[PDB]
Amino acid sequence: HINSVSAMKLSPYYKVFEEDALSWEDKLNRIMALFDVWIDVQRRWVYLEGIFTGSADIKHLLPVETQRFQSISTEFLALMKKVSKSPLVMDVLNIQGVQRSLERLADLLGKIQKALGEYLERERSSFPRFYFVGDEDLLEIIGNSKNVAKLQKHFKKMFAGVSSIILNEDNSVVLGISSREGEEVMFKTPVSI
Amino acid sequence: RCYLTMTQALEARLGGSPFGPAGTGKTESVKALGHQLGRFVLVFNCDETFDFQAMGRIFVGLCQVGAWGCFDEFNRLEERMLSAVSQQVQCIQEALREHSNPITCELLNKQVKVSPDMAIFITMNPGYAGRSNLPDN
Amino acid sequence: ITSIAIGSAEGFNQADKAINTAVKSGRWVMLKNVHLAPGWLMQLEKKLHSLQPHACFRLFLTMEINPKVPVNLLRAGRIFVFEPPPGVKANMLRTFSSIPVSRICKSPNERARLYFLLAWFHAIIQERLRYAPLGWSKKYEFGESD
Amino acid sequence: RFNRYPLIIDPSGQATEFIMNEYKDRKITRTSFLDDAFRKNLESALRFGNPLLVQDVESYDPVLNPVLNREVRRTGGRVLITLGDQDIDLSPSFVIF
Amino acid sequence: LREELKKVCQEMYLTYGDGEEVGGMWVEKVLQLYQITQINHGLMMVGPSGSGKSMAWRVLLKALERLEGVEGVAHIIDPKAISKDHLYGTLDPNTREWTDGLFTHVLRKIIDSVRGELQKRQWIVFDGDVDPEWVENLNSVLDDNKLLTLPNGERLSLPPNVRIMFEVQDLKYATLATVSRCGMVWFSEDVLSTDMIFNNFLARLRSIPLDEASPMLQIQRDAATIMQPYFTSNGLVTKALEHAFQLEHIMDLTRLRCLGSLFSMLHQACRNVAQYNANHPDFPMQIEQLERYIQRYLVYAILWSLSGDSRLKMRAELGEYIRRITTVPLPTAPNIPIIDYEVSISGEWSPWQAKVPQIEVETHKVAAPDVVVPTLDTVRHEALLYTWLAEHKPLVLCGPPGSGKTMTLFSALRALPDMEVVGLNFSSATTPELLLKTFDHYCEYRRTPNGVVLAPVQLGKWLVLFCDEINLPDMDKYGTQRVISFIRQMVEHGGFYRTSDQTWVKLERIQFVGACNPPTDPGRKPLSHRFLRHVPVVYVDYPGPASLTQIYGTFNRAMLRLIPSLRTYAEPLTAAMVEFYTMSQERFTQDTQPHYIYSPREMTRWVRGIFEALRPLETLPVEGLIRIWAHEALRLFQDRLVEDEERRWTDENIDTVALKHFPNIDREKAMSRPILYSNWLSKDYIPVDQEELRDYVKARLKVFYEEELDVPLVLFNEVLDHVLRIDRIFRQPQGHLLLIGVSGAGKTTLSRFVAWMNGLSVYQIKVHRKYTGEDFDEDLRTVLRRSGCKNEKIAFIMDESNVLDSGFLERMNTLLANGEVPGLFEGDEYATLMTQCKEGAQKEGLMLDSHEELYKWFTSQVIRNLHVVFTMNPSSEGLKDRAATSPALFNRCVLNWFGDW
Amino acid sequence: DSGFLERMNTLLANGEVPGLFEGDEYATLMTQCKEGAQKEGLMLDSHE
Numbered sequence A: 001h002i003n004s005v006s007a008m009k010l011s012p013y014y015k016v017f018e019e020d021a022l023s024w025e026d027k028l029n030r031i032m033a034l035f036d037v038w039i040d041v042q043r044r045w046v047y048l049e050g051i052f053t054g055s056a057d058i059k060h061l062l063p064v065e066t067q068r069f070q071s072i073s074t075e076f077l078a079l080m081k082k083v084s085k086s087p088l089v090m091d092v093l094n095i096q097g098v099q100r101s102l103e104r105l106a107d108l109l110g111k112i113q114k115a116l117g118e119y120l121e122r123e124r125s126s127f128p129r130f131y132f133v134g135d136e137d138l139l140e141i142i143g144n145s146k147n148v149a150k151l152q153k154h155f156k157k158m159f160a161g162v163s164s165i166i167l168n169e170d171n172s173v174v175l176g177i178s179s180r181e182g183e184e185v186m187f188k189t190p191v192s193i
Numbered sequence B: 001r002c003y004l005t006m007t008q009a010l011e012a013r014l015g016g017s018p019f020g021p022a023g024t025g026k027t028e029s030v031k032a033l034g035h036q037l038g039r040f041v042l043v044f045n046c047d048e049t050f051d052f053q054a055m056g057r058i059f060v061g062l063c064q065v066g067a068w069g070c071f072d073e074f075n076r077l078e079e080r081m082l083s084a085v086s087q088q089v090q091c092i093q094e095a096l097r098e099h100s101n102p103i104t105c106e107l108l109n110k111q112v113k114v115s116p117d118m119a120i121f122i123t124m125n126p127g128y129a130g131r132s133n134l135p136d137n
Numbered sequence C: 001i002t003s004i005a006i007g008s009a010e011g012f013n014q015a016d017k018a019i020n021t022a023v024k025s026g027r028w029v030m031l032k033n034v035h036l037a038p039g040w041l042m043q044l045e046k047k048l049h050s051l052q053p054h055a056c057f058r059l060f061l062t063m064e065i066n067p068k069v070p071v072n073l074l075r076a077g078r079i080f081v082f083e084p085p086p087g088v089k090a091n092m093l094r095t096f097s098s099i100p101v102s103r104i105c106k107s108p109n110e111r112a113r114l115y116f117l118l119a120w121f122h123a124i125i126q127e128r129l130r131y132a133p134l135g136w137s138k139k140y141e142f143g144e145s146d
Numbered sequence D: 001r002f003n004r005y006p007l008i009i010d011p012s013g014q015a016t017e018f019i020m021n022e023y024k025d026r027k028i029t030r031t032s033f034l035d036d037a038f039r040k041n042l043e044s045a046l047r048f049g050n051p052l053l054v055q056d057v058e059s060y061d062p063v064l065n066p067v068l069n070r071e072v073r074r075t076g077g078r079v080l081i082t083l084g085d086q087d088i089d090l091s092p093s094f095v096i097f
Numbered sequence E: 001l002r003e004e005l006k007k008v009c010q011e012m013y014l015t016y017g018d019g020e021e022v023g024g025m026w027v028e029k030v031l032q033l034y035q036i037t038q039i040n041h042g043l044m045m046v047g048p049s050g051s052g053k054s055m056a057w058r059v060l061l062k063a064l065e066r067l068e069g070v071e072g073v074a075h076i077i078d079p080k081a082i083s084k085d086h087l088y089g090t091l092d093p094n095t096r097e098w099t100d101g102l103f104t105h106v107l108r109k110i111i112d113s114v115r116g117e118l119q120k121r122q123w124i125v126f127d128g129d130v131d132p133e134w135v136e137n138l139n140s141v142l143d144d145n146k147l148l149t150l151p152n153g154e155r156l157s158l159p160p161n162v163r164i165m166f167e168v169q170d171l172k173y174a175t176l177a178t179v180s181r182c183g184m185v186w187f188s189e190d191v192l193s194t195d196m197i198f199n200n201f202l203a204r205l206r207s208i209p210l211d212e213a214s215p216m217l218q219i220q221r222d223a224a225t226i227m228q229p230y231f232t233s234n235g236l237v238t239k240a241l242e243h244a245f246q247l248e249h250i251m252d253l254t255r256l257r258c259l260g261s262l263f264s265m266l267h268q269a270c271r272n273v274a275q276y277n278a279n280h281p282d283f284p285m286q287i288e289q290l291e292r293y294i295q296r297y298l299v300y301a302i303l304w305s306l307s308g309d310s311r312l313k314m315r316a317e318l319g320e321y322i323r324r325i326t327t328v329p330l331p332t333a334p335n336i337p338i339i340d341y342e343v344s345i346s347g348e349w350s351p352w353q354a355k356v357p358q359i360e361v362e363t364h365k366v367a368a369p370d371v372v373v374p375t376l377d378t379v380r381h382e383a384l385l386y387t388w389l390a391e392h393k394p395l396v397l398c399g400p401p402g403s404g405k406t407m408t409l410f411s412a413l414r415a416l417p418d419m420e421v422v423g424l425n426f427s428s429a430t431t432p433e434l435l436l437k438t439f440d441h442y443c444e445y446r447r448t449p450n451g452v453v454l455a456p457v458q459l460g461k462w463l464v465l466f467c468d469e470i471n472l473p474d475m476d477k478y479g480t481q482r483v484i485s486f487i488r489q490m491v492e493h494g495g496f497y498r499t500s501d502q503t504w505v506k507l508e509r510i511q512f513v514g515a516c517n518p519p520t521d522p523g524r525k526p527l528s529h530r531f532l533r534h535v536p537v538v539y540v541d542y543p544g545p546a547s548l549t550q551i552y553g554t555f556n557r558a559m560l561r562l563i564p565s566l567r568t569y570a571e572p573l574t575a576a577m578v579e580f581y582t583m584s585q586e587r588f589t590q591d592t593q594p595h596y597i598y599s600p601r602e603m604t605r606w607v608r609g610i611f612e613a614l615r616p617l618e619t620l621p622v623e624g625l626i627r628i629w630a631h632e633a634l635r636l637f638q639d640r641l642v643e644d645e646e647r648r649w650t651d652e653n654i655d656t657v658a659l660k661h662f663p664n665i666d667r668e669k670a671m672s673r674p675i676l677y678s679n680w681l682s683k684d685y686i687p688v689d690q691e692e693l694r695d696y697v698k699a700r701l702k703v704f705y706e707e708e709l710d711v712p713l714v715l716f717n718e719v720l721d722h723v724l725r726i727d728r729i730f731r732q733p734q735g736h737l738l739l740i741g742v743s744g745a746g747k748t749t750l751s752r753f754v755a756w757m758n759g760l761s762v763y764q765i766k767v768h769r770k771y772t773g774e775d776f777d778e779d780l781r782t783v784l785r786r787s788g789c790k791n792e793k794i795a796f797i798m799d800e801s802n803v804l805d806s807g808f809l810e811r812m813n814t815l816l817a818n819g820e821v822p823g824l825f826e827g828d829e830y831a832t833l834m835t836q837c838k839e840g841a842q843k844e845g846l847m848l849d850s851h852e853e854l855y856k857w858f859t860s861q862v863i864r865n866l867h868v869v870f871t872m873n874p875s876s877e878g879l880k881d882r883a884a885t886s887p888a889l890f891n892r893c894v895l896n897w898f899g900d901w
Numbered sequence F: 001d002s003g004f005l006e007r008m009n010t011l012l013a014n015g016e017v018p019g020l021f022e023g024d025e026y027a028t029l030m031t032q033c034k035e036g037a038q039k040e041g042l043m044l045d046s047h048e
C-alpha cells in the first residue's frame, strides 16, 4: 500500500487527492514503524519470560533484574489486554502513547537482556556445547525450552552434521536427528520431554 | 604423510602444526583426519583480537565438549598473546597425558574437565604478511 | 617452582604474586619470554634490587637475543647464552647430559646404542645446519624437541 | 658546591649512601619517582626544609619543574612555590638530590 | 536476462550493446559477473576507477529482480572508512561482552531473518581497499567453510542466498590467500567508453530536470540537441581530453574527473539560460542566441575542466591546441589566450579584465582579511568556484601555501547567501572523528520513514565543510587514508554508517570543499583516484610580480592617505616590497629548512605593520617611512632564520633594496644598527634606542620580581629584541607564538614577563605523571571558559614536553586554527558553557538568541583573548614531525628562532 | 533568615528539596546519580 501510494503520488492527477493521500501515507509510515518496534519487543519478551519463568532461583541471584522484568512484564500484559479489547489495527495505532511506550519497553528489554551474561555462563558450563553459541541464541534456546521449534536453527552452531531434530506431533518426543539436506538418523531409544 | 605425522603427534599428546603456502590443503587435511576419526572439528579463523581470556574460554569449551580445534593463521595472534596461550596449551597437554596415564586442569583460574577426544591443531603460512613468530616454548 | 609465560596482564599479576611468595617463603620462580615486556622488565629489576630475598631463592627468566632487553636488568642479572653447541663432541655431551641415565639404562641393552646413534645423527645434521646454505637449503630448527 | 640541584649517576649506590650519611643530622627521607608516596614526601620536604633524595630519575616527574627552576613568589612576607595545583610555603633550608 | 538488462539499462540511462555495439564489452562483463555469481559465493570486481563495476553489479541486481521476482538488497560497506574494530566487533576487557561490528551486524541480521531476510537475494559489497588486516578474517567466510569466526567463539554460517563481493580499484596489497578464495571479474578501462559516458550525460540532460513540458526541460533538451555533435565520435571533447592527457598536471588526471567537471559546467550553463529567461519574460531565449552561447560555453568549459589544475602555460597550450583543431567561433586574439575570455549570456566572448576596474578601498579596512583586491585570476577562480558550489558538487583547491585558496572560496561564498562554511583543519593524525564532531555540533540526526537523515540545524541552509589540509592525513602501510575513504563514501554513496547502532545515515544539505598543497610537498600525499574522480581540482598559483605589484600598490595608496606628504612614495615602496619578497622567496626555500615558506601572507602582514604604525602618528618623513618599512621587513624575514649568515644577508639586502628604490635619502636616519620600535615609553608605536629601553626594562623586571616571579635575569640586546617581538605578537589579535631555542635560554620566563607587562594571565597545564588526554581536555575547557566567557586575556604557555600523544597536538592544532574545538564541550559541559556565555553576553551588553550565535560569540571572544605560546627545542626531525602533525604551528603561529646564546 | 529554615524543614521532612537543583544543576545531578547507580549496581531508566 505504501508503494502504491508513492506510485499515485507522482502522476497523473495527484493534486486532487494530495490532502488525503499525504495523511494516509503518514498513517502507513507510523503504523509500519509501530509494528517494526512491536515484533522486536514481542520476540524479546517471549524468551525473556521463558527464562524468568522456567528457571528457578533466579530472583535469589538476580533480584533487581527479576523485579524489573516483572515490572515491565506487568505493563506488557496490560498492553496485551488492551490490544485484545481493541483488536482493530487502526485502534491499536490510535492507542495513546503506544509508540514511545514500545520504544521504552524495547530499551528496558534490551538492558535486561544485556544484564544476563553472568547467568548465561553457568548454563554454558552446564551444557558444554553452549560455549559455541552466542548470548542472543542461548537466551532464545533457554527461553524456548517449552516451545521447541525455534531451536531447530540453532543445532547447526553446536553440532557438526546435525542441523535439525525429528520431533513427535505432541512436541514431547525427539525421534531422531537430521542433516541439512534430508539425511536422517532414527534413534533406538527416543528421549522424553 | 599428513595423516601419519598428525597421528604421531596425537599419540605423543602434542598438537599438529601443518605449515606451507596457501592452497596446499592444510585446513582441509586436518578436517578430513578429524572426520575420519569421527571427531567434531571446530575451525577458527584466529585474529590479533583473540584475547588470552577468549582463547582460554574457547579452550575450556573445546575441552568440555571433546572436540578438535583447528586454528588457521595462528601466527596472527601477536607475540605476547601467543606466549601467554602457550601456557594454556601446555596445561591441556598435561591433562591429556594425565588421562592417558575427575581428570581436570586449571584454565582461566577455574577448574575445568578435560575430555580425551579433543585436540589442538594450528595452521599457518610463514611470512604471509610479516606475521608473528611462534616462541620456542 | 612456578612457571609463568610473560605477555598478559594476568601473567604480570601472577608473576608479581609468585615472586612475592617466593621471596617470603624460599621457593623458586620462573617467568619466560621476557623480551616481549621491556617496560615491565624495568620495574621488575627495580623491585628485585629493592627487595631483600630469602637465602635459597633463584629467579630464572628466559629471553631471545633481543636489543630491546633493558641494559640495567641485563647488567644486574647473570647471563647465560644458549646457542646450538659448536662441534659433534659438544652436541653429544649436551645430548648425554640431557638424557636421563635411568631412562637410557632401561632394558634391553640396545636402547643406549640406539640413543647414541640418534645423538650422532643429530650432531651431524646440526653441524650441517651450521654449514648453510650448502649443508641444507634453509636454516631448519632441529633441536631438543625433535 | 652545586647551584642547580645535583643528579647523581651511581651504578653502585656508594654516592647514595654517602649522601644519606652526610645529611643524617638533617634527616633525609628516601623516595623514588615511581612511588605513590612521592608527592607528599616532596611537599613535606618543601614545607619543613628537609633534605630529599629521589631515586629512579629516568622516570622523572615533571611536577619537579618549578622546584628545579626555583620559581618563587614573594607576595608579602610569604615565600611561595607552586607544586601542581597547590601552593606551598617554601622553606629556605630545602635541598633535593 | 539480456532483454531484462536492456530494459533496466533503458530505465537507468545506461547504454546497452548487443555484443558488437559500443556497450557489448560492458554487457559481456555483466554476463560474466552473473556466471561467477552462479558458480561462486566469493567474488571480486577489480579494475581502474571509472570502469563500470558499480553499474554492472547494480544492473545485474535489477535484472535478476525483474527476472525471478525475488527482490535483491545490496549492503555497501567501506571497509577502510571505519576501523577494523567497528567493522567486525570488540570484546570489552572489563566485562566480557561482545558488541557487533558493521559486517557482523549485517550478516547476523540476515541470518536471523526477522523481516524475511533469508528469502531475499542479499549482496554484501565491500567498496574500498583490501589489505590482509581485515580480509584474512574473511578467509574462512570465503572458504568452503562459509563460517564467520569471532573471538568469543560465536561462529556465523553463510546462508546460500548471500553473496560477498569486493569492488576494488587494485589488488596491490592483497595476498594469494585472499586472491585464491574469490572469483575474479576484471573490468578494464576500455570496457567503459567515453561514448557511453557522453550518452549517459546527454540522456540525463534530456530527462530529470535540474529544477527539483517545463521551460527547464525545454532549455535542457535544446542545449543537449545543440551540443550533441561535439560529444559523439571523435568530435571535440574526446580529442581535447586525449590532448589534455599529455599535459602535466599537479593531481593525476583521470577521465571521469574532467568529464564530471564538464557536466557540472554545462548544467550551470543551462541554469544560466533559465535565469536569463526569468530575467526577461517578455523576450524568450532565441534559438540562434542559445546556439551561440552554448557553442562558446562548451569550449570555455572544456578548457577549465581539462586544464584548471594545470599552470598558466599548460592551459594556454590547451587553448591554442583547441584553437588549432576545432572549428568554433573564437575571439580574434594575437597574444591573450582563450582562458582569459569569458562567455556572456548574450552569446559573445568578453574579456575577464573588463569585469573589475581598479579599486580604492577605504583607509579603515584597507587591508582587512575580508578585503580582496580583484584581479584576473581572482575573478576567474571566483567564477569557477561559484560554478562548482552552485550544484553542491565537492571540489578541491590546490596550490602553494598562502596563494589565496581560502579567500577565493570565501569570496565565492559571499556570492551565495544560502550557504554556511565550517572550517576544518586536517592534520597527520586526522580521523573521521573530526568530521563526526563537526556533524554533532552543526547538524542533527533526524529519523525518517526512509531512514536516518543528517541535516544542518539551520533550515533552508547548506552546510559547507571546508577541509584545509586533505593531503596531510596519514596513509597506512597499505596506502589508504581513512578520512579520505570516509569523504569518498559520503560523496559517492551520499552518506555513511553510524557506529553506535550500525545504521546507514543519509546527508541532506551538506557539501565538502578541500584545500591542499601539491602532493610533492614533504608532508603531503597523493589522493586516491576513486575519491579524486568525484572532486574537480583547480590550481591556484602565486599571483606573480605583475599581479602582486598592483595588489599591494592598491593597499599602499589606500593607507598613504592620512598624510599627503608621503602619497607620492607609494609606487617605489610597493616595488621595494615586491622585490625584497621575491629575493627572499628565491633565496630561502623549503629544502634548507622546513619552515622557509614565503607567500603573499608576508606581504599582507607587511602592509598591516606599516598601516598600524602609521595610524596614530599623522606626521612622518621619508626616513621614518623607510625605517618602519625596514623594521617590518626584519620582523617578517629574519625572525624565522636559523643562520647568522642568512640574517646578515637579509639585513644587507634590505639595505640594498631600500637604497635602490629610495635614492637621495638620509642613510643614517633611515638605517640604524639596533633599529627597535616600542609602544611602552610613549602612547604610540614609535622607534626607541637601546639605552632608555634597557633602563625601562630593568625597572620593569625590578617590579616584576616581587609580583609574579622572583628569578633575577641578565639583560642584553637579544633579550630586548625578543621581548619586543613577544610584545608585538601579544598585541596582535589571535597572536600565537612559536619559540625555537635550547632549554634554559629564557623563553617561558621572557614570555611570562611580557604577559605581565601586557596584562595577560599566564596558564600552564602542570603536566605530571599519569597525566592524560582527559586532564588536557579539562585544562583546555578551563582556559577556553576563562578566555571566552569571563573576557580574560590569557597567555597560554605550552612546552613540547607537555605533549604526551597525538591527541594533545590535534586539539591544539584545531584551537590554533579556528579558535574553537568541536566536541570539547559536550552535554553538561556544553550546557554550562551556554549559560556562562549567555551571562557573558549580558555583561558585554550584546543581545543574543539561541545557542549558535552564542557559540559564535564565544569563539570570537576566544580568538580575541587567547594567546598561545609554544616552546620547543630545535631538531630537524622534530620540526618536520611538528610541521606534518600540526600545520597551525607553522601557519597561524609566528615563529621566532631564539636558538642558542 | 526564614529562607534557610524553610529549605532545612523540607530537607528534614522529605530527604529532598524541590527547586534546589534547577537548570544545569539538575543535569549535572542526573549525570552524577546515573554514575552512582551504575557503581552501586542498580539499573535505572529516565530521571524520575
Ligand SMILES: Nc1ncnc2c1ncn2[C@@H]1O[C@H](COP(=O)(O)OP(=O)(O)OP(=O)(O)O)[C@@H](O)[C@H]1O
Binding pocket: E013, E014, E015, E016, E023, E026, E047, E048, E049, E050, E051, E052, E053, E054, E055, E056, E168, E169, E192, E196, E197, E199, E200, E256, E529, E530, E533
Ligand atoms: N553502461 C553504461 N552506459 C553509460 N554510462 C555508464 C555505463 N556504465 C557506467 N557508466 C557511467 O560511468 C560512471 C562511472 O562508472 P561506475 O559508477 O560504474 O564506476 P566504477 O567502475 O565502479 O568506479 P570506482 O572504482 O571509482 O568506484 C557512472 O557514473 C556512469 O555515469
Ligand SMILES: Nc1ncnc2c1ncn2[C@@H]1O[C@H](COP(=O)(O)OP(=O)(O)O)[C@@H](O)[C@H]1O
Binding pocket: B020, B021, B022, B023, B024, B025, B026, B027, B028, B029, B123, E143, E144
Ligand atoms: N587431497 C585433496 N583432495 C581434494 N581437494 C583438496 C585436497 N587437498 C586440498 N584440496 C582443495 O584445495 C583447497 C585448499 O584449501 P585449504 O585446505 O584451506 O588450503 P590452505 O589451508 O593451505 O589454505 C580446498 O578448497 C580443498 O578443497
Ligand SMILES: Nc1ncnc2c1ncn2[C@@H]1O[C@H](COP(=O)(O)OP(=O)(O)O)[C@@H](O)[C@H]1O
Binding pocket: E371, E372, E373, E374, E375, E378, E400, E401, E402, E403, E404, E405, E406, E407, E408, E515, E543, E551, E600, E601, E604
Ligand atoms: N588579490 C589579492 N587581494 C588581496 N589579498 C591577496 C590577493 N592575493 C593574495 N592575497 C593575500 O594572500 C594571502 C593568502 O592567504 P590564504 O588564502 O588564507 O592562505 P591559502 O592560500 O593557503 O588558503 C592572504 O593573506 C591575502 O591577503
Ligand SMILES: Nc1ncnc2c1ncn2[C@@H]1O[C@H](COP(=O)(O)OP(=O)(O)O)[C@@H](O)[C@H]1O
Binding pocket: D069, D070, E711, E712, E713, E714, E715, E719, E741, E742, E743, E744, E745, E746, E747, E748, E749, E750, E871
Ligand atoms: N637572561 C637570563 N639571565 C639569568 N638567568 C636566566 C636568563 N634566562 C634564563 N635564565 C635562567 O633560566 C631558568 C628558566 O629558563 P626557562 O625560561 O625555563 O628557559 P626555557 O623556556 O628555554 O626552558 C631560570 O631559572 C633562570 O635562572
Ligand SMILES: [Mg+2]
Binding pocket: B026, B027, B028, B072, B123
Ligand atoms: Mg587454511
Ligand SMILES: [Mg+2]
Binding pocket: E053, E054, E127, E167
Ligand atoms: Mg564504484
